[PDB]
C-alpha cells in the first residue's frame, strides 16, 4: 500500500487532504527523529477489433457486400444470399412448405433461418406477397415489396431484413424516411436463396449479432389466422 501510494502520487497530490496528511507524516517523522492518445499522464488509449469469423462453426454470420447483396453464412460451406432487387425470379403464388417438409431434402439450418426470418416479420397479412421454390432441397423465397407506409408488407419485411443483416443493411435502407420506425426502399422484391460459401463481406464485417437478436423476435408480432393455433 505504501509503495502503491508512492507510485500513484500525482493523481492524489491535488487533494488538500492528501497534502495535509503528507505534511503531518513528515512532521511526525522529523519530531520523532529529533528526540498515441494519453490520459491522466499514465493511461494510453488502445483499441481491439474482434474476429467474428472464428465463430463460424457454431453460429450464423451475416454481412453485406453492397447495397443490394447481403449474406448469412452457416459454417464454411453454405449460406443464404439476400438480394434487394427489382428483378423477380418467381412469377407464381405458391409456397409449398408442406411438401418441402415431407420431402426433407433441404439444409435444416437454412430452413431454420428462413423460419426465424418469416416468423419475425411484424403484422404479415398478405400471403400472396410471399412466393417460394423448394424443389430438390433448394431454398428460394421471394417477398413482393410492391405497394401510409407503416401498415404494409414492404415495411414489415424490410424491418426484419434490417435486423437480419444488421450492419451494412442501412445503405439499402432509410431512403424514404417514414413515420415512426417505418422503412421504405425503391426496391420491388427481397429474394433469399441458398448459396455456397465465399468471402462476400466487402462492406461490413461478418457478425452473428443480427440473427441472435432476431431469435427473440420470433412470433412476437404475428397475427392470428384461425381460432385454434
Amino acid at each position, epitope marked *: 500500500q505504501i509503495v502503491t501510494f508512492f507510485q500513484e502520487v500525482p493523481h492524489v497530490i491535488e487533494e488538500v487532504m492528501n497534502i495535509v496528511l503528507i505534511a503531518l507524516s513528515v512532521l511526525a517523522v522529523l519530531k520523532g527523529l529529533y528526540n498515441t492518445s494519453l490520459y491522466k499522464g499514465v493511461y494510453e488509449l488502445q483499441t481491439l477489433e474482434l474476429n467474428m469469423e472464428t465463430l463460424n462453426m457454431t453460429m450464423p454470420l451475416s454481412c453485406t457486400k453492397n447495397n*443490394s447483396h447481403h449474406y448469412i453464412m452457416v459454417g464454411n460451406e453454405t449460406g443464404l444470399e439476400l438480394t*434487394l432487387t*427489382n*428483378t*423477380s425470379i*418467381i*412469377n*407464381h403464388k405458391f409456397c409449398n412448405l408442406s411438401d418441402a417438409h415431407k420431402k426433407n431434402l433441404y439444409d435444416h439450418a437454412l430452413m431454420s433461418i428462413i423460419s426465424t426470418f418469416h416468423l419475425s416479420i411484424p403484422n404479415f397479412n398478405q400471403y400472396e406477397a410471399m412466393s417460394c421454390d423448394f424443389n430438390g432441397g433448394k431454398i428460394s423465397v421471394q417477398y413482393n415489396l410492391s405497394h401510409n407506409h407503416c401498415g404494409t408488407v414492404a415495411n414489415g419485411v424490410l424491418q426484419t431484413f434490417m435486423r437480419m443483416a444488421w450492419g451494412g443493411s442501412y445503405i439499402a435502407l432509410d431512403s424514404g424516411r417514414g413515420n415512426w420506425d417505418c422503412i421504405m426502399t*425503391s426496391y*420491388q422484391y427481397l429474394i433469399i436463396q441458398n448459396t455456397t460459401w465465399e468471402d462476400h463481406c466487402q462492406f461490413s464485417r461478418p457478425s452473428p449479432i443480427g440473427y441472435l437478436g432476431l431469435l427473440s423476435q420470433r412470433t412476437r408480432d404475428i397475427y392470428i389466422s384461425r381460432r385454434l393455433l
Partner: antibody
Amino acid sequence: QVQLQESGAGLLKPSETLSLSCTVDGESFNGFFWTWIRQPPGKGLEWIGEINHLASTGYNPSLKSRVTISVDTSKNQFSLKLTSVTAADTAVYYCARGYSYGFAWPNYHYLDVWGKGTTVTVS
Amino acid sequence: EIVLTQSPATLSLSPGERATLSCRASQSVSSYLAWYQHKPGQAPRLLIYGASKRATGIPSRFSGSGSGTDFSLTISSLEPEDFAVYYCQHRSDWRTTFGQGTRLEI
C-alpha cells in the same frame, strides 16, 4: 463463347402444334430469362415469352391461351409449344438469352445471345 | 403495360452522315431501353443496353441516351454496313415489349 442450337419442324398444317426446342451451349443456365421471340413477315419483332431455371414464366397475353414454355435443366434446354396454329403463326422464330439487371438504377435488360432462327410456315 | 413507338418510321440518310433514332415510351420506363440491329436473313444483334452502354464488339460509333419516357440511339458517322432495321426494347417484370422498328436506308 455461347451458342443457342435450335431444333424443331417448321412445316405444319393449320391447327397442329408447333414444337420448337433450343439447347444452350456455354455459360450458366441460371440467372437468365430464356426467351422466345418471333417475327412474322411484314411485321417487327414480337415477344412470345420467357422462362427461368425455376420454370417461372411470362407470356404475351395475345398468345397466353395457346403458348406453353418449359425447361429441362438436365440438358440445358428450353422449349416452346404453340397450339392451334393458323396463318398468323407464319414467322421466323428465335430463341434468345435475356439478362435482367435490377440491382441498381438504371435497371436494364437485354437479349445478348440469339439463335439462328427457324422458318415456321403453316398452310 | 408499357409500349414503345419509334420515330421516324423510315429514315433516309447518306453514308457518313449522323443518324438519330427516337423511342417514346407510353410511361416512365421500368428499365432503360435496349437497341437491336436486325438485318434480313440473320438474327437481331444487340447494340445498346441501359440506354447508354455498348454491347460486346459494338463500335464506338453507336451511342445511346435517354431517360424517363424519351430515348435516343445515335450513329455518329454511319458506314454502309449500318443500313438495317433498329428496334428499341423494354422490359417490366415478366413482360417484354419491342418497338415497331425504324428502317435506315440510303
